[PDB]
Nucleic acid binder design. Structure first.
Ligand SMILES: Cc1cn([C@H]2C[C@H](O)[C@@H](COP(=O)(O)NP(=O)(O)OP(=O)(O)O)O2)c(=O)[nH]c1=O
Ligand SMILES: [Mn+2]
Ligand SMILES: [Mn+2]
Ligand code: NA
Ligand code: NA
Length: 326
DNA sequence: CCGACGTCGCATCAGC
DNA sequence: GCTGATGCGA
DNA sequence: GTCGG
């Protein structure tokens, strides 16, 4: 964090554009800029120096010069003072509440945590659970707790069917010392790109984790993706652990490497890699890498038998999970 | 100058 | 009910 | 907001 002040500024600007202006490409522009500055191994001395980096243009360069000279940004100082922007930004911190619902709530005079708590009937299920655990979801997860959680998940999954493979991805697989949540990739030989020989594969696992009181709430749930809440068990007279967000994704077993590449992240890393893939004439999702034809249409899936194969196709040197934290 | 910006799952809604 | 778009999220 | 062509 040689340039923590700058990256903080840009992230706050990113959040404004996403939540208030509802301009998603500005949000990504700022986040991309923040990321490239974050890994820049010098303390930045000027906006001109920063503009040399890919993703930093004229406007951000000027903001960096203002921030360097004064320690502040007048544009952000004004935004911070605005009631509507501040209220909208706050409401979006609740899981299930996005830019649209936040602005609608503020219109209806619901703009504080207290306002939300007395208008619970106006929330959908996701938002209601998000409000319930607002405090808990603010807290990060120490890696040591992540290891406890991994142990439970992998063992409970094993008990259902010993041919399941569960892999913890996201920031954990990238070796982070603390995570925002837990991300679990799931495979079973019955579910491939060719066929589904077994129903309720994800359901079976979710059910087991509920039975042992690990999973406590559900935000969303379908055939391949689960979004919910979990909690570590605590001992006698111990204060309870905070409730944690958990994401589970069932991927066709023969498409594990594309799946694990996707869910390992980071989000910005995926954006950068897939953009580069397009430049190289391929498209990548969580299932396949495919060539783009002359007319621009995706062709048939290419052979993949390691994460590295995917890097090879787009002419990138392989990068370990710990080097993908962009 | 300006088109494009990664890709997709689940909840919810409009229109039929 | 289905189809397609919108919102929020991974 | 940025940038490749
Ligand atoms: C949010 C997001 C996530 N992903 C993939 C890559 C992420 O690393 C992976 C898990 O999402 P996450 O749990 O929201 N983020 P994280 O695990 O990287 O970091 P954190 O510690 O959970 O905050 O899902 C995307 O591909 N695009 C996205 O926009
Ligand atoms: Mn995560
Ligand atoms: Mn997650
Ligand atoms: Na630049
Ligand atoms: Na939210």
């Amino acid at each position: 964090t040689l340039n923590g002040g700058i990256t903080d500024m840009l992230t706050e600007l990113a959040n404004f554009e996403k939540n208030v202006s509802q301009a998603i490409h500005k949000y990504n522009a700022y986040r991309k800029a923040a990321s490239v500055i974050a890994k820049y191994p010098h303390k930045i001395k000027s906006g001109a120096e920063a503009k040399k980096l890919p993703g930093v243009g004229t406007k951000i360069a000027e903001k960096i010069d203002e921030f360097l000279a004064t320690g502040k940004l007048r544009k952000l100082e004004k935004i911070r003072q605005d009631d509507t922007s501040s209220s909208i930004n706050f409401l979006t911190r609740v899981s299930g509440i996005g830019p649209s619902a936040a602005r609608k709530f503020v219109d209806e005079g619901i703009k504080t945590l207290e306002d939300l708590r007395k208008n619970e009937d106006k929330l959908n299920h996701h938002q209601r659970i998000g409000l319930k655990y607002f405090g808990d979801f603010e807290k990060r997860i120490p890696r040591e707790e992540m290891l406890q959680m991994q142990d439970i998940v992998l063992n409970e999954v094993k008990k259902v069917d010993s041919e399941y493979i569960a892999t913890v991805c996201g920031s954990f697989r990238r070796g982070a010392e603390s995570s925002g949540d837990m991300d679990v990739l799931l495979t079973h030989p019955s579910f491939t790109s060719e066929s589904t020989k077994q129903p309720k594969l994800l359901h079976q696992v979710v059910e087991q984790l509920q039975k042992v009181h690990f999973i406590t709430d559900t935000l969303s749930k379908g055939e391949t993706k689960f979004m919910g809440v979990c909690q570590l068990p605590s001992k006698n007279d111990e204060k309870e652990y905070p409730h944690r967000r958990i994401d589970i994704r069932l991927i066709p077993k023969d498409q594990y490497y594309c799946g694990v590449l996707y869910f390992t992240g980071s989000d910005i890393f995926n954006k950068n890699m897939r953009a580069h893939a397009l430049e190289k004439g391929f498209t990548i999702n969580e299932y396949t890498i495919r060539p783009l034809g002359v007319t621009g249409v995706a062709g048939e899936p290419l052979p993949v038998d390691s994460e590295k194969d995917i890097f090879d196709y787009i002419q990138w040197k392989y990068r370990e999970p710990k080097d993908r934290s962009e």
